[PDB]
Design a protein around this ligand. Structure first.
Ligand code: HEM
Ligand code: HEM
Lengths: 660, 662, 241
């Protein structure tokens, strides 16, 4: 109920990997007969298995739906969900109400997967299957990038968009507009992109609902062990083929249901509509006063008059969408352009910087939602770096300030969609220059910029991370525990023209426990926000512990307050934080009802010697965290703390170095 | 609700260890100033911290209790709980109602722990603290063995109190009814009647109980209190909350008159004085020596005394006819009392530690005991030629790949991870009662050959020859599949005597289920696949390890009773990936034969003919998505050599689980 | 040089003196390569040796995995200049008891020279000589240095018999490249050998490795060392890898 999910931090360890911890996905992919795989998938598109026969002999409308459902769980606010991890194979998502019949879509892929092995990953295979499905219908794709490496656990750190039957099952296309707008915006799609996506997605294929919904058995994670991973069995007729029930409605949008065209808009505007319901008593819209032109998927002697979903008529009756929809009605090449751009986006939005793309179809145009970086105009040598280190050392910035700027630049990285990090020097451009938590760190920027004019040998992103390197090496020497702090050069500075302020304003922390910044007091607890930040950084609980303590003694507080500075030598890297935190000398009292500030007084004299927040004091309250605190506070753990903190620091410096 | 707990198999990984994956506890302990640590602990025994003042200036009564609560969560039926993993520091156990004030006892230990680091572990430090506490009152100890290495996660097993309600059953203050409660609870811990008497009488000679006022004064347990409490629970508003107002159990009983010296006074008063019924201030039933003077010094106020008192649980012994006799045995002979108590105390604190080869340190007793599962010194030293020769002999004996693999697995798979018992060392497969267990029946048919091969060669023991038989079987089967591999062998096991195999404590090791050979005993206990998980956890395996071994054991035909459940191949005895290929192949549809759905037929979805049969243990690997994710790895086209290597490594790991001698 | 290309099958190596016997296994493999159109003859030729070594290790009760790197290609006669490849003909291959002429150097110096050309260490050369002797890999299949009764099993019999003071060795003629072993008690004649078998008990640096392999705890050890050296000599020309 009220727990600290330190258990988030344990996921994806050596224990659950069936492949080893040396498996290089990139190097395995190098071996793939990529075009022969595309040939075998195209073959598959029309090989009809008796336990799930193909509509019009074609499984293409099935695979496009699978790939789109995969990608559509994305969120822009944190970077979780999406199609980058293959997660649609595991619970819970494999069993969600909106993915009925995608288990058979995944099962039909197993012979290709088996022939190929680890050379391709399930998470790449899905998106490529959808692509091939599109490319075989007449439509042309923007390009494809592989690189989604597979995982083996269901991510514990957390109705794909809307209801097809209008909001609240009220068959009014009007009310569905705001729903579509909000849901698709949460994913970073604008109005035009939404129109293109929906209209395109709904030209191939169909919806399935021969009979009553009660004929369908339980979802994959609730069915009998002899079902061997498949859910949603059906008692209706055959239960499969022309009797399939998945969504529950019966809509076919075009008349060449397996060829690309411009017919969706065509019939959309070229017909009035009446309100009926599919046999399962769900609302449908029917093109009125129309002939018989739609071939039936399994009988070559019956026909049907066009039909639509409420959610298909929203992008017609609604005034805002009408204009894009007619733009495309009278220009289908514009339609193809826009749909293909949006489709590439939708399937590559949680993949990260272009350096993560691999394969022979990676588009050459840089896009803005890729967070692009320019080619480098610097190649610093070894003397150049020793020189920059002498210079920064001699500048007059304190250990605190140097560490502050390095951390402020690196700590924007999220693990989910792979965005943020220190490459690019976005700390210098808008809007990060003017963020609340960055206010102090910024006071060290104008010096470094100057050191970067005088030296024209490195970029400002490299000089920014080097400043932190110097600060940590100095602080280790002060504690009598001198260490080498590794530096990887070769970062580049980006241009304001590549930093879209709107999509970088999503990267602003509501809280950064490592520098004592919280923003609002109605979202979560300070310590769960701490866990959440650490997870986004892909850290372990020891890593998080060592870094909090180190950043406390170095005095890396935003605003440079003295919350949790448990020492007298601020700027030297000792274990003073854990020693003072655990020593039963001081008792801690909360200052007020907004219990985020506490005073430490001496349980003997009573005087007040320290202050702290909930982020300093979870490390003596949660037992799993205190178990690591004690390790670092124990008599044989000075060099140990220094090495552990240095390794974790360098790991957080290099999270976005996919170029390496 | 109804979910496989594959996530048992993920615990204790590289990610959560704050130390290296190279930390050798034994080697760190070698550096411990062991007697200087004992000096600093006895120093601590009397250094009284103001936030929790010492009773009679002595925390000893406090430490003995904490070590006893540690050890007392043990269960004999599977080997979980106990004091071998230090778990009393973590949730949930750190917060159970029965450990109120034990957070103080753990807190008071932190300066010694800090001075010494990883050179002693919390799990060893606790038991040693209790020992020193005993040795400082006048009592002498049987001996102590260190070796409990610390862990970093709370073990997700299935479990309120430790043994019984102190206040009689169902709070009805009658000592009579408490007898059966004590008998059952202590027996399931592996203690007999006399040991129970000694433990309960000894534990209650030192210290006291705490309950100045209304319990409602006490605050929340450690896993529920404000973050400024810094790990301590059960705060109290009564008076000081601490010192002479300490409230934990809620009862106020002092059993002797030298409450800090060993004696024979517990029994003395128990029988000498009669008793009347009252209640401590917090409204709990108490027994107090009637018509007695004032003799018991008060823990903080000198000029004050109290008349003896007792717990309901102290008055079952002396009244239940059974216990009275042991209790008077001990009344009229306290040297017997001391000997029995000390033996039982050593036992209680070392019962989940395992074979003597796991004990380290300078106080390890020299007498072998029966609950240690002892092994004799070896009378064999096989050379390299002797092993090659034994391998030729076994190969030329006429046992099949199936039989050889069967005997090796049947001997090794008794190991539990919790209390470290079982395994292949000793050749208990040959002695009673394992020779005659239902699941071993077939494997047993390969015993009389090997025994003969062992008479002819007097160069190895039968435990080594038994594991070597499995080595030969696996190497043969790898050669049959065109994937030849080396199967490692560690010699040096010893054969034990029937005189060291107590049938009663080995009948607890009988599997209710061994999914790796298609044996399930009863149909009321659990699901077959959760029993599979449970077996694999007891073996300390990973989910990949368990997958690879199930499949391998299926093709080698290692079914008990040798049925064709899950034998998805035509070359039985060759080590291929045929199991995963046929299991995942959408060719066959699987149907359940009857309402007791533990048997299914596979028929091909085209002709309909029946080609295979299987149980729930074969078919979870295509129903659970985490397990199927590993199945597919092994069924994929580049995974022949891979399956062979993975199965061979897991096999050798399960051969060597009890080799603490190494 | 090396195994990539299958020059053993083309001219002039098909017809070299030392290859004469080995060539009698070519027409089988070529046929196994028509029936299977899945690998090249260079890969099938190295795979043949892999199978042979794995079988021999199983015979000695010391089963081991012999690694195989696929992906070799077969070259065409047009890419094999006979005049350039006639320089690659051995004057001596101590590892199979072939020496050609008797006025160039000593048999054991030519042995060192061959081993250096292969970039081997002295242990590597020792282990391979002994293994090749028990497997019976003599060109012309003579019984020079076959110090065992289980020909085709991979044991340490070569070093054990070579070092045991039971047999005394006499030179048969003034040539002195052939010696008989007879039992120093009965007199009978149990073995024959050449200077290439017998330097491993005359040079002290070499005998120091012989004794390692002849000692009581060196069965698995000899097998592993020979297997590693074999795979190293299979892969010397794999610059494509
Ligand atoms: C407002 C957003 C959307 C709604 C309300 C919606 C609704 C639906 C429904 C109810 C079905 C019937 C499912 C079944 O019974 O099998 C369906 C099918 C389908 N959806 Fe969508 N969808 C949306 C967006 C998309 C997008 C964005 C795409 C692709 C980019 C897409 C591609 C498809 C395809 C190809 C089918 C045909 C399925 C088949 O042939 O089996 N949909 N959609
Ligand atoms: C029938 C089994 C037992 C019962 C019902 C029982 C009950 C109790 C209770 C209610 C207390 C008072 C706790 C408090 O308020 O602080 C106590 C204290 C104590 N227990 Fe037991 N106990 C049992 C077994 C044992 C055993 C087996 C040992 C040692 C081997 C032991 C050692 C102690 C000691 C030394 C104290 C004194 C605590 C102090 O000085 O603070 N007990 N016991």
């Amino acid at each position: 109920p009220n727990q600290l999910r330190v258990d988030l931090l344990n996921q994806h360890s050596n224990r659950s990997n069936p492949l080893g911890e040396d498996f290089d996905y990139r190097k395995e992919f190098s071996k793939l007969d990529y075009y022969g795989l595309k040939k075998d998938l195209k073959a598959l598109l029309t090989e009809s298995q008796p336990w799930w026969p193909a509509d019009w002999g074609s499984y293409a409308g099935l695979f496009i739906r699978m790939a789109w459902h995969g990608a559509g769980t994305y969120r822009s606010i944190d970077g979780r969900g999406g199609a980058g991890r293959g997660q649609q194979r595991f619970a819970p998502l494999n069993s969600w109400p909106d993915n009925v019949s995608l288990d058979k879509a995944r099962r039909l892929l197993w012979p290709i997967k088996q022939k190929y092995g680890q050379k391709i990953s399930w998470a790449d295979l899905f998106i490529l299957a959808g692509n091939v499905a599109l490319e075989n219908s007449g439509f042309r794709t923007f390009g494809f990038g592989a690189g989604r490496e597979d995982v083996w656990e269901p991510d514990l750190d957390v109705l794909i968009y809307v209801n097809p039957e209008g909001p609240d099952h009220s068959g009014e296309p009007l009310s569905a507009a705001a729903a579509i707008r909000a849901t698709f915006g949460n994913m970073g799609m604008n109005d035009e992109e939404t129109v293109a996506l929906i209209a395109g997605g709904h030209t191939l294929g169909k919806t399935h609902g021969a009979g009553p919904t009660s004929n369908v058995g339980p979802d994959p994670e609730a069915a009998p062990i002899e079902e061997q991973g498949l859910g949603w069995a059906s008692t209706y007729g055959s239960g499969v083929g022309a009797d399939a029930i998945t969504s529950g409605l019966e809509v076919v949008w075009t008349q060449t249901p397996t060829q690309w065209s411009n017919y969706f808009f065509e019939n959309l505007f070229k017909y009035e509509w009446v309100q009926t319901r599919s046999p399962a008593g769900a609302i449908q819209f029917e093109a009125v006063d129309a002939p018989e032109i739609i071939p039936d998927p399994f009988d070559p002697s019956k026909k049907r008059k066009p039909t639509m979903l409420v959610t298909d008529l929203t992008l017609r009756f609604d005034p805002e969408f009408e204009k894009i929809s007619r733009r495309f009605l009278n220009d289908p090449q514009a339609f193809n352009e826009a749909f293909a751009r949006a489709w590439f986006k939708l399937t590559h939005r949680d993949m990260g910087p272009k350096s993560r793309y691999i394969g022979p179809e990676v588009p050459k145009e840089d896009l803005i939602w890729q967070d692009p970086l320019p080619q480098p105009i610097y190649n610093p040598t070894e003397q150049d770096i020793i020189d920059l280190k002498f210079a920064i050392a001699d500048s007059g910035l304190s250990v605190s300030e140097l560490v502050s700027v390095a951390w402020a630049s690196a700590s924007t990285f999220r693990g989910g969609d792979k965005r943020g990090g220190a490459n690019g020097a976005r700390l210098a451009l808008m809007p990060q220059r003017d963020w609340d938590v960055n206010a102090a760190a910024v006071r060290a920027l104008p010096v470094l910029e100057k050191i970067q004019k005088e030296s024209g040998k490195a970029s400002l992103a490299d000089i920014i991370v080097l400043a932190g390197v110097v600060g940590v090496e100095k602080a280790a020497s002060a504690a009598g525990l001198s260490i080498h702090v590794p530096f990887a050069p070769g970062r580049v500075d980006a241009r304001q023209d590549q930093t879209d302020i709107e999509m970088f304003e999503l990267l602003e922390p509501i809280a950064d426990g490592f520098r004592n910044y919280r923003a609002r007091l109605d979202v979560s607890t300070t310590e769960s926000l701490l866990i959440d930040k650490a997870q986004q950084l892909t850290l372990t609980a020891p890593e998080m512990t060592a870094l909090v303590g180190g950043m406390r003694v170095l005095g890396a507080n935003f605003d440079g307050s003295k919350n949790g500075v448990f020492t007298d030598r601020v700027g030297v890297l000792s274990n003073d934080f854990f020693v003072n935190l655990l020593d039963m000398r001081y008792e801690w009292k909360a200052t007020d009802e907004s219990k985020e500030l506490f005073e430490g007084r001496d349980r003997e004299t009573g005087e007040v010697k320290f202050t702290a927040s909930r982020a300093d004091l979870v490390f003596g309250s949660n037992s799993v965290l205190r178990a690591v605190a004690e390790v670092y506070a124990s008599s044989d753990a000075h060099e140990k703390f220094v090495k552990d903190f240095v390794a974790a620091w360098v790991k957080v410096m290099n999270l976005d170095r996919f170029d390496l």
